[PDB]
Amino acid sequence: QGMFAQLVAQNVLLIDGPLSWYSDPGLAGVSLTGGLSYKEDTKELVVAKAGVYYVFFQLELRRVVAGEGSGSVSLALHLQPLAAGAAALALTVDLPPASSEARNSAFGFQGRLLHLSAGQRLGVHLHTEARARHAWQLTQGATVLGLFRVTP
Amino acid sequence: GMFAQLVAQNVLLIDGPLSWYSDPGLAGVSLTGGLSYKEDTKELVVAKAGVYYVFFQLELRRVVAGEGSGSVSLALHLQPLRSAAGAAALALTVDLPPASSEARNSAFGFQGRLLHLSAGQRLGVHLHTEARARHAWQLTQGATVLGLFRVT
Amino acid sequence: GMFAQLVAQNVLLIDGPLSWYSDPGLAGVSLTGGLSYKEDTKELVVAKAGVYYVFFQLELRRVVAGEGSGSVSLALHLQPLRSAAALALTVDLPPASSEARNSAFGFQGRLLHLSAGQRLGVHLHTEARARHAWQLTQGATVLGLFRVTP
Amino acid sequence: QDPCSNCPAGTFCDNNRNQICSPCPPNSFSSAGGQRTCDICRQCKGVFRTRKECSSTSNAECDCTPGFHCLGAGCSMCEQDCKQGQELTKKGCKDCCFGTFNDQKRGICRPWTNCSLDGKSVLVNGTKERDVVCGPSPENLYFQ
Amino acid sequence: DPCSNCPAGTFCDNNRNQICSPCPPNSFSSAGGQRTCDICRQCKGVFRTRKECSSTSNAECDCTPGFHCLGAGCSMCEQDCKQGQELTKKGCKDCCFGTFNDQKRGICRPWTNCSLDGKSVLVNGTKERDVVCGPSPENLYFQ
Amino acid sequence: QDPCSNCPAGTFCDNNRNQICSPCPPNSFSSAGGQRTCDICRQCKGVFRTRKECSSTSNAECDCTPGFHCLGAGCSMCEQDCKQGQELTKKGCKDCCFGTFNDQKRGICRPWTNCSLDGKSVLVNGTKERDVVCGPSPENLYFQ
Ligand SMILES: *[C@@H]1O[C@H](CO[C@@H]2O[C@@H](C)[C@@H](O)[C@@H](O)[C@@H]2O)[C@@H](O[C@@H]2O[C@H](CO)[C@@H](O)[C@H](O)[C@H]2NC(C)=O)[C@H](O[C@@H]2O[C@@H](C)[C@@H](O)[C@@H](O)[C@@H]2O)[C@H]1NC(C)=O
Ligand SMILES: *[C@@H]1O[C@H](CO[C@@H]2O[C@@H](C)[C@@H](O)[C@@H](O)[C@@H]2O)[C@@H](O[C@@H]2O[C@H](CO)[C@@H](O)[C@H](O)[C@H]2NC(C)=O)[C@H](O[C@@H]2O[C@@H](C)[C@@H](O)[C@@H](O)[C@@H]2O)[C@H]1NC(C)=O
Numbered sequence: 012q013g014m015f016a017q018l019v020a021q022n023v024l025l026i027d028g029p030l031s032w033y034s035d036p037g038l039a040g041v042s043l044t045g046g047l048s049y050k051e052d053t054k055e056l057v058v059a060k061a062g063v064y065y066v067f068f069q070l071e072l073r074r075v076v077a078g079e080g081s082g083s084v085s086l087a088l089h090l091q092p093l094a095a096g097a098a099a100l101a102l103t104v105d106l107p108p109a110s111s112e113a114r115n116s117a118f119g120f121q122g123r124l125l126h127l128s129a130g131q132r133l134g135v136h137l138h139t140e141a142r143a144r145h146a147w148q149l150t151q152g153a154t155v156l157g158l159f160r161v162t163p
Numbered sequence: 164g165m166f167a168q169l170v171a172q173n174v175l176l177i178d179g180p181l182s183w184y185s186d187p188g189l190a191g192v193s194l195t196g197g198l199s200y201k202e203d204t205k206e207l208v209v210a211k212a213g214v215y216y217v218f219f220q221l222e223l224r225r226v227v228a229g230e231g232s233g234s235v236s237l238a239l240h241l242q243p244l245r246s247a248a249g250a251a252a253l254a255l256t257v258d259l260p261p262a263s264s265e266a267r268n269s270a271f272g273f274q275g276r277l278l279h280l281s282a283g284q285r286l287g288v289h290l291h292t293e294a295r296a297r298h299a300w301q302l303t304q305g306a307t308v309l310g311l312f313r314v315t
Numbered sequence: 316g317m318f319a320q321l322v323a324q325n326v327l328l329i330d331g332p333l334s335w336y337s338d339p340g341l342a343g344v345s346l347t348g349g350l351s352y353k354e355d356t357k358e359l360v361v362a363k364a365g366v367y368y369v370f371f372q373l374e375l376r377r378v379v380a381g382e383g384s385g386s387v388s389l390a391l392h393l394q395p396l397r398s399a400a401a402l403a404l405t406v407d408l409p410p411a412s413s414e415a416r417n418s419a420f421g422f423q424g425r426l427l428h429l430s431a432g433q434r435l436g437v438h439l440h441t442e443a444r445a446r447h448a449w450q451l452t453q454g455a456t457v458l459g460l461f462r463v464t465p
Numbered sequence: 466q467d468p469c470s471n472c473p474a475g476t477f478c479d480n481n482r483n484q485i486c487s488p489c490p491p492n493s494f495s496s497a498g499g500q501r502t503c504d505i506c507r508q509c510k511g512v513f514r515t516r517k518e519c520s521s522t523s524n525a526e527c528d529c530t531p532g533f534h535c536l537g538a539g540c541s542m543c544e545q546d547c548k549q550g551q552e553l554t555k556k557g558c559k560d561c562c563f564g565t566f567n568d569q570k571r572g573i574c575r576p577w578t579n580c581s582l583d584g585k586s587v588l589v590n591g592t593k594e595r596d597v598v599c600g601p602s603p604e605n606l607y608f609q
Numbered sequence: 610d611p612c613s614n615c616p617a618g619t620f621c622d623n624n625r626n627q628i629c630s631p632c633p634p635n636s637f638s639s640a641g642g643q644r645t646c647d648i649c650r651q652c653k654g655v656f657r658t659r660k661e662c663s664s665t666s667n668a669e670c671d672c673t674p675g676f677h678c679l680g681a682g683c684s685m686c687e688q689d690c691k692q693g694q695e696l697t698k699k700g701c702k703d704c705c706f707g708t709f710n711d712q713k714r715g716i717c718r719p720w721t722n723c724s725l726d727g728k729s730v731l732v733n734g735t736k737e738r739d740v741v742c743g744p745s746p747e748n749l750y751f752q
Numbered sequence: 753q754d755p756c757s758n759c760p761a762g763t764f765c766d767n768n769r770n771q772i773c774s775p776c777p778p779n780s781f782s783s784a785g786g787q788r789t790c791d792i793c794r795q796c797k798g799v800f801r802t803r804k805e806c807s808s809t810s811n812a813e814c815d816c817t818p819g820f821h822c823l824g825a826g827c828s829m830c831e832q833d834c835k836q837g838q839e840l841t842k843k844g845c846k847d848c849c850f851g852t853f854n855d856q857k858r859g860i861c862r863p864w865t866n867c868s869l870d871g872k873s874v875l876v877n878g879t880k881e882r883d884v885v886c887g888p889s890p891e892n893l894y895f896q
């Protein structure tokens with residue numbers, strides 16, 4: 012069983028801060044094989060074996076209050092320990108203002124190759140620049156952090 | 164190596180299952196042993212169980228100047244599996260911008276994630292349109308793609 | 316293993332081939348043996364044949380407040396050019412509004428069969444008004460690939 | 466044969482442990498037997514309230530916080546109770562069609578009074594928000 | 610080099626030990642040396658097949674009656690230009706000011722200039738209609 | 753004597769060459785020692801100008817070309833200098849709020865002249881672009 016993982020976000024409400032993740036592999040859409048594990052206190056995924064990984068996350072939102080809510084939402088992947096500059100993965104999804112043509116969901120996907128060593132911690136932070144934030148929520152099961160090792 | 168990539172034959176925006184090219188002699192199409200396309204049921208059949216990085220992408224173009232608006236979605240259906248886990252294992256919506264002075268004449272979306280596929284599982288893609296003047300938009304030929312490779 | 320990730324050097328929206336950072340001593344850039352970067356032709360050269368997952372992403376930021384609109388497209392080209400683009404992405408630049416959407420992003424990946432000696436170029440095309448108002452986000456326009464079989 | 470077929474609802478057939486069936490993890494459920502995973506429970510937060518809580522065999526169900534109503538099967542999204550001049554349809558709050566009115570929150574559109582049927586004039590025309598105001602007979606001294 | 614001048618209509622088959630295999634159906638290879646054939650273009654909906662695909666050349670589309678091609682390779686269709694409009698290389702554009710077109714699928718023509726034989730403009734023109742000339746400005750019609 | 757702690761700012765601990773220190777590649781920097789890679793230097797082009805060039809140790813700083821000014825931290829965006837009727841605020845150029853004015857490029861909003869304070873009338877009301885024009889005392893022969 013090669014080194015790979017996929018976590019489904021627990022959060023529904025748009026609040027700035029670290030996302031909490033489902034990590035039990037018995038849950039549909041969640042896989043945590045090898046020596047990989049999840050630190051629930053710090054909300055970080057800890058890497059099992061060193062290598063280069065294809066790391067990706069997915070961001071899907073649904074309008075939960077009809078006719079309300081607009082702005083944008085952002086995810087950032089943070090590595091622990093850190094170089095000094097930048098974030099490893101950044102994805103911004105715009106929420107369309109409510110209109111007759113506007114749909115009530117929004118989606119964004121981004122993927123990257125990342126150097127990860129064993130014992131490295133990966134956290135994701137949610138940021139929101141939205142008006143009437145209550146009108147949008149994270150689509151349950153569709154905000155996902157995944158990674159698999161490409162150096163076999 | 165265990166991977167497949169199919170290119171959709173479909174051109175017209177009609178609700179229903181997409182049909183796929185499966186001959187590796189064609190550009191964009193490759194398959195290994197253990198992955199095969201059943202033409203009569205429009206499904207990609209997986210032979211070996213495992214975890215796969217599965218992705219699809221959807222590109223549309225405006226074919227009638229000045230017309231067309233709405234949205235188009237793709238859903239990956241897994242069979243056999245309970246509806247909760249396999250109905251929308253992969254789902255993506257793209258919006259058709261109304262015809263305007265901006266003259267935005269194409270739309271694009273991409274999604275991927277890790278799925279556990281069982282031996283004998285069959286992958287099908289359903290196209291759904293909620294659009295006005297559907298005749299004015301078409302799938303860009305060669306740019307509607309379903310791909311996957313086993314991570315293990 | 317066999318993989319590479321290049322980070323674009325360009326920031327200004329100009330029609331033509333993108334130039335790439337390729338030294339793996341930089342954050343975000345990696346290049347194993349069997350893949351190399353030809354600087355004069357701005358081409359990534361594959362040395363060993365196989366099927367790779369190739370992906371690139373395009374991120375743009377508005378650098379002039381209240382200005383800039385249109386679209387920007389990336390295209391991955393194989394030379395041996397034969398007689399189409401292997402990957403093709405078009406990102407739309409929102410007009411300036413009070414809603415203030417000042418970034419634009421696109422991502423595409425797929426499986427590509429590459430033969431020994433295959434060279435990869437990425438070309439940038441702009442169809443924008445006031446293109447000075449938009450720029451490539453530095454470190455966020457990326458082309459990557461890794462081998463899948465063998 | 467296949468031992469997963471005997472894992473009941475509330476468990477899943479665990480490919481990660483030595484045991485064959487494991488109870489659903491917290492915040493999850495399996496409504497049928499023989500599942501290889503359990504499904505993450507629906508959470509009802511913000512505008513949503515928890516009408517029925519999640520169990521190991523049954524998904525939670527949401528409704529909308531007071532002053533809002535559900536829209537869509539399974540209460541997919543919430544919508545403010547319709548105001549004066551609209552009525553609730555399956556696709557949300559909709560203006561009263563021409564000739565009908567509704568004067569109160571959470572009402573139904575109903576046609577205007579036809580004063581002409583009772584032989585009365587129209588002093589003030591109605592709108593989607595108000596009924597007509599009929600006057601005296603046209604003949605009545607009020608009309609010269 | 611391998612695959613060197615695999616003739617048009619064939620592709621260098623990595624699966625048949627690099628024999629030049631014939632292109633699969635609905636594909637073509639207009640050049641030598643290709644390792645795959647390209648999928649034939651389909652002309653459906655508003656498009657019609659002008660030229661059919663062959664093993665050596667792609668199909669070519671045109672537009673269904675009532676529309677005309679717009680792009681370089683007929684990349685989209687546009688409804689036939691109406692009165693007040695002229696078909697350009699970039700689609701139906703309105704007649705330049707001072708000119709008109711009073712018929713569907715027509716070319717813009719400049720307005721009649723009444724002043725040339727000393728006449729007057731009674732009704733001005735638009736993009737859709739020519740001016741109407743009247744009597745001389747000094748005619749007692751105008752007083 | 754941890755090997756990577758031997759590499760100071762301006763180099764990185766090359767994990768491709770067995771923990772030797774390598775100088776930062778061209779157009780990069782490392783602001784602390786012991787980093788395993790250097791980060792690409794900020795470029796300042798187009799509407800941007802280089803305020804401080806980057807070194808092996810420090811990142812480059814951008815400012816805006818004349819006629820424009822920086823918006824946001826680190827000069828992440830440029831904005832044309834504010835014209836008459838506006839004032840430069842942290843969020844950009846903003847109209848003078850009601851009762852104030854600025855009559856020049858790159859100015860600040862000042863309050864209108866209170867004509868009543870000096871016992872004078874108002875001949876022309878001000879705007880965000882112009883001060884009011886006061887007149888003679890209302891009891892003057894100017895006024896009937
Ligand atoms: C009362 O209002 C009617 C208007 O109907 C619609 O609803 C209103 C809330 C408003 O939005 C209005 O714009 C709408 O048209 C009138 O009947 C309508 O009259 C218009 C104008 O001729 C006509 O286009 C509509 O078809 C017609 N409705 C129907 C169902 O046929 C009432 O009477 C009109 O006014 C008279 C002067 C005369 O034109 C008569 O034929 C009209 O019916 C309005 N009544 C009064 C007393 O104002
Ligand atoms: C007859 O229509 C001519 C067409 O030009 C119009 O320009 C716009 C103003 C608009 O009305 C549009 O629909 C037309 O395409 C007029 O000529 C224009 O006149 C305007 C004056 O407002 C002038 O600015 C334009 O440059 C001029 N266009 C051209 C191509 O010359 C005629 O106006 C007559 O000419 C003027 C010089 C002036 O003498 C005016 O009093 C005249 O009526 C229109 N003439 C008549 C008799 O209707």
Ligand SMILES: *[C@@H]1O[C@H](CO[C@@H]2O[C@@H](C)[C@@H](O)[C@@H](O)[C@@H]2O)[C@@H](O[C@@H]2O[C@H](CO)[C@@H](O)[C@H](O)[C@H]2NC(C)=O)[C@H](O[C@@H]2O[C@@H](C)[C@@H](O)[C@@H](O)[C@@H]2O)[C@H]1NC(C)=O
Binds near residue numbers: 850877878879
């Ligand atoms: C001069 O203008 C003042 C502010 O005008 C506002 O901004 C302008 C750009 C314009 O759009 C105007 O309509 C705006 O209201 C006036 O004071 C304001 O007047 C409005 C009138 O409804 C009132 O609601 C505001 O509270 C008031 N603001 C303050 C701080 O007092 C000046 O006086 C007004 O106009 C006079 C004719 C008189 O009626 C006075 O009572 C009004 O307040 C303007 N002075 C003039 C015109 O001499």
